[PDB]
Amino acid sequence: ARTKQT
Amino acid sequence: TKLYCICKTPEDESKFYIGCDRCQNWYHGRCVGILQSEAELIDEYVCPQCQSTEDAMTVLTPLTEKDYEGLKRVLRSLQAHKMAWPFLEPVDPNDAPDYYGVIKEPMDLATMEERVQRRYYEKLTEFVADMTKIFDNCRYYNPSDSPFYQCAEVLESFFVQKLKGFKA
Ligand SMILES: [Zn+2]
Ligand SMILES: [Zn+2]
16 A cells, blocks of 8 residues: 555 | 544554555544454455445346356256245146236246346346246235245345355
8 A cells, every 4th residue: 555654 | 634533634654544445445444444454365345335335236247158058057946946836837727817916917937037148137136127027916916834934034035145255
């Protein structure tokens, strides 16, 4: 999946 | 700066986001119920609203080649079921006159098989409607405590489970 994390 | 998620907020780099491959919006994992550890295990992500739309449209999309083959397998499974005996073939006009006096839209599994063969059905909803007609006709014509009525109850329960996850 495409994600944005710290 | 854009606004994202169901909560309509600008990007906060301290928060975890997951992107929906269908609508292309971004969602806080916390707002859609998915943690980073869980997100690692899935390839594509479909947000809750998009997933609800996909679930609802399953019965409306065109029946594909594979769908038709699957419908045949579903019919075969029902035809082999112990409680399917009252529904395998049309009621014999000769065994039962008033059946047709009150049922003008009869339906049975053999007739449904013929309909799948010639591609009478073009959407899953149409196939499900004919199956439901088999059971509704039966429950309309027989008492609830009768074996016929209960066979419809049993087979419909079996049918609902058999159809789970049917569409690609
Ligand atoms: Zn949010
Ligand atoms: Zn979406």
